[PDB]
Write a protein that binds this ligand. Sequence first.
Ligand SMILES: OC[C@H]1O[C@@H](O[C@H]2[C@H](O)[C@@H](O)[C@H](O[C@H]3[C@H](O)[C@@H](O)[C@H](O[C@H]4[C@H](O)[C@@H](O)[C@H](O)O[C@@H]4CO)O[C@@H]3CO)O[C@@H]2CO)[C@H](O)[C@@H](O)[C@@H]1O
Length: 377
Amino acid sequence: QTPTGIYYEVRGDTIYMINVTSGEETPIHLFGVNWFGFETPNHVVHGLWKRNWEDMLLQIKSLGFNAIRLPFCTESVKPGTQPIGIDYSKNPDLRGLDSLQIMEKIIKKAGDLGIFVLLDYHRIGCTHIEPLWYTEDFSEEDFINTWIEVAKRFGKYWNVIGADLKNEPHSVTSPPAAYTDGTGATWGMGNPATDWNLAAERIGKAILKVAPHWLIFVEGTQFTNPKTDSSYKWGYNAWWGGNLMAVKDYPVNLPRNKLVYSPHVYGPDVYNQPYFGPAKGFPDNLPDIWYHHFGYVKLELGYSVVIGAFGGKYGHGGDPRDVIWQNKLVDWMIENKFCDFFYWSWNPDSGDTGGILQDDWTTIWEDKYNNLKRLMD
Ligand SMILES: OC[C@H]1O[C@@H](O[C@H]2[C@H](O)[C@@H](O)[C@H](O[C@H]3[C@H](O)[C@@H](O)[C@H](O[C@H]4[C@H](O)[C@@H](O)[C@H](O)O[C@@H]4CO)O[C@@H]3CO)O[C@@H]2CO)[C@H](O)[C@@H](O)[C@@H]1O
């Protein structure tokens, strides 16, 4: 039931942490951040060329966080991979090892601070986010077998709540072609080879045999199926990993208490959505959009919903209307009790969102930040 003694499960729409020995059943809430860079060639979380890692953690935590999502790619996971671009004068603690260890160690330090960790299979390649959980030179079986391996080492770390099966399933072409052309993910279309809802069942089942104590995080797709997407005005405008409109009629076939739907959502910085325009309704049009794209999955369906990645900067690195966006969003999450989230990113170098911070990998965006603590409150 659990090697660790800690069993994670979903009750109602709340994530519970259950100490199987003592019997304590504790509802937990995830106030997290995305510590990216493990889905990269540098093979390490970023910003370490300017600072020490626990300072990052300590700094993280002290800001009020209890969980971090660690994006990774296939190589980061296999033994001999070497990171790159780090300043050892600052971090001389880890000597000679597999981005897997700095990784393992990062997880270790996080738990001492009582921080939970969500493992995310971000990229098969260390370059970009493929639209599918397989490629010409990398098969689904290779993907699943890799998730199994990852479910073994990292399975033992008590603060690891589960697996984000695949980071941002999406399309690389537009509908109606995208639906039946096989280059992109779908949901409720029919073909088990592109339907993420069926693939998620196959991958998740494999993961639960090895880590039955874990939670299965299933993100949305970009497009699902013509009938579903055409049912809502902004149906064709959801984010990669942000379309959960097909959950009602095409629920992933996995035990309800192990399943967590994890949509991704963003503002003006990442991509200039059309409903972001005052002409259409920004920003008061936002509640109904979030609702339709994924909100109803918890509010109406009763499933556990965790925002796996959202972020940007109420700010200047670029666009201002992002201020109104991140505001209206946190307001919204509070009104509806969406208290489990993962900010993107704690890394200032997200050319489209920066971290929760600033490039001298030192200071945090005060206002961008004061807005987010409200939720943790
Ligand atoms: O991983 C480290 C790396 O991260 C980079 O940031 C990534 C984001 O993490 C990722 O979520 C983001 O994905 C975007 C994509 O770039 C946009 O082009 C795409 O826009 C979509 C839109 O979402 C759809 O609604 C619309 O219909 O189609 C458009 C595309 O035409 O939206 C997705 C998110 O849903 O990509 C970022 C990178 O570009 C950092 O930038 C990098 O520095 C970090 O090293």
